[PDB]
Ligand binder design. Sequence first.
Ligand SMILES: Nc1nc2c(ncn2[C@@H]2O[C@H](COP(=O)(O)OP(=O)(O)NP(=O)(O)O)[C@@H](O)[C@H]2O)c(=O)[nH]1
Ligand SMILES: [Cl-]
Ligand SMILES: [Mg+2]
Lengths: 241, 169
Amino acid sequence: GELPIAMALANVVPCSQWDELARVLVTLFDSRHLLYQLLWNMFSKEVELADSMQTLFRGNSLASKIMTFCFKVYGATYLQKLLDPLLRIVITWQHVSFEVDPTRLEPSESLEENQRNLLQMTEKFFHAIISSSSEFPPQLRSVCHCLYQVVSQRFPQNSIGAVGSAMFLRFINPAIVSPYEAGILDKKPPPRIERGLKLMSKILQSIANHVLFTKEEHMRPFNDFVKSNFDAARRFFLDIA
Amino acid sequence: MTEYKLVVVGAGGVGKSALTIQLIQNHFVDEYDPTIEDSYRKQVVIDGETCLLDILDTAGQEEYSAMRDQYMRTGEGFLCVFAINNTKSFEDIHHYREQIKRVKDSEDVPMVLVGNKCDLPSRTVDTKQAQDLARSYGIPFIETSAKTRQGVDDAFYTLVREIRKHKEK
Ligand SMILES: Nc1nc2c(ncn2[C@@H]2O[C@H](COP(=O)(O)OP(=O)(O)NP(=O)(O)O)[C@@H](O)[C@H]2O)c(=O)[nH]1
Ligand SMILES: [Cl-]
Ligand SMILES: [Mg+2]
């Protein structure tokens, strides 16, 4: 009965050291082939204690930190082999520009042409992800399914969305925004590229969250691209879970 | 016209976006849509000076921490936000402030402490705890609520005033 004692002792650890706790819990229960049983308890204890789906895996709770740790530990080599060929193609790539904010646009550059280079890059990344189902590491599929199984107990009509937004917000998009810090590249990209990657991760997050741009005025023109990729994203998530 | 570069920082779910959107669009969002990095501009009048606010609404999710090093060099002032019903958000401001001083290499940099969700009756962070940490930092402290719009303008305007005080003379 290893799990009920680990759950009792986790109550004691204060909030300052939840990072080490998640690492210790996952390394401990995986080496005993019980990772799925740990994730089920932790994920169940944050779905049962949620008022609604709006506030569910948001923020950085202990269960959230365990989930992020798992994505980072079991998807590390999958994300690098998947994103590295695409990052090195847009880095090395002549006279491309990604600034789509009119307040920050250089006078020489065109807005309507800079919007098309962002969308062109977004397809290549988006299409690569939804076609990567067969290279998914198995440990990562069980993490995603366990989340899907737990959230469906109380929120069947939103389970597919929770898994997709979780994977994009805490796994894929962090890597795209800062590839050097995630180990994918060996050097920070040039500032023109870093700007595009950050803007693209915003577009991909909208598709995963199944919601359109309604805040920044300069991101609304991408709402048509976002609508046309909702279903393709839900089909990819339905496969992983 | 003068431009003030304000940055809003704090843990996830504290209400950083709801406060910014209340200033920019004059309405309260009840959606919890986690931010990556958002940029807004608004022209206001503050102590009779017409000026521009260049606001950067940052990400509270710790997975996006590699982005902090860049907006902390580019920003002039910082709104440090916590919710008064979440005590880990209060403990997280310690790390934010001591990572802004490390990046700017200054022990004094424009900054305002903000305690959000004062419309909520349940309160796990008393007012004396924040005022005492604010005096420890030589910075103001403003209680706000994005839901009722109480104190949101006071929050941004006091940050602008704190930026004016940090300018030589
Ligand atoms: N009752 C109440 N709820 C609030 C208040 N401010 C924000 N909220 C709620 O708190 C949730 C999170 O708000 P949000 O502004 O997105 O917080 P955030 O700091 O931007 N999150 P993130 O750092 O991930 O981008 C939403 O449900 C929002 O309605 C407030 O003053 N009162
Ligand atoms: Cl138990
Ligand atoms: Mg936000």
